[PDB]
Amino acid sequence: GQELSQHERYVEQLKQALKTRGVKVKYADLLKFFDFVKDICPWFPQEGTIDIKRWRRVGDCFQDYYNTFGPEKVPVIAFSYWNLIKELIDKKEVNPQVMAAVAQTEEILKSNSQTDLEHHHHHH
């Protein structure tokens, strides 16, 4: 959600990198969103976090299939992919939804094995 603002600035950074590849001028957010959103999130485009283990499984499936299918528009962007996914998470260490899925799913407030409410304790 709000993290969207962060995605904007980044989107601009990703475009610059590809720009140095001598590649034409295309949108990264869209090209990636549509492709990925439908890739790891084919039935749930609501969130869809960045994943290396999954994107890899679904990545090879569609990819290994598209290529083995002898395509007529064999894009080079392929080679670029995968490698970018790794270096991506790194520069993402900033504070994306990935880090949130942790603070949210595993709130620090959680007791030893109870809940954040903590019946034993009473604060107000």
Ligand SMILES: *C(=O)CCCCCCCCCCCCC
């Ligand atoms: C809430 O709607 C914000 C979206 C939550 C997940 C997105 C977080 C960052 C997305 C990474 C994009 C870069 C690689 C595709």
